[PDB]
């Protein structure tokens, strides 16, 4: 839910090249992707342990 709105904001605000919010945008993208990948990997491993439990 957060990811899809952040990326839409990226497409909308950077249709063109604004140089001012260029540097902040890379930080935002790095932060959200480094969060989400960790989230997904932990969820998959938890689901695997839950599957093995039976």
């Amino acid at each position: 839910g957060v990811a899809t709105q952040l990326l839409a904001a990226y497409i909308l605000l950077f249709d063109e090249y604004n140089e001012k919010k260029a540097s902040a945008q890379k930080d935002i993208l790095i932060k959200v992707l480094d969060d989400g990948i960790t989230k997904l990997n932990e969820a998959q491993k938890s689901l695997l342990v839950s599957s093995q439990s039976f």
Binding site: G1, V2, A24, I28, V32
Partner: protein
């Protein structure tokens, strides 16, 4: 709860544009206000 958390984190990352006049940020704040109003009205 997670529905509110979504808009919360969304506005949190909308902070880091270093713009207090961003219409995206203002509108997301308007969204969160009405979200909190509808949650509190349920209680």
């Amino acid at each position: 709860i997670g529905e509110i958390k979504t808009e919360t984190e969304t506005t949190r990352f909308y902070v880091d544009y270093d713009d207090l006049m961003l219409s995206l940020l203002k509108e997301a704040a308007k969204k969160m206000i009405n979200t909190c109003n509808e949650y509190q009205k349920r209680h």
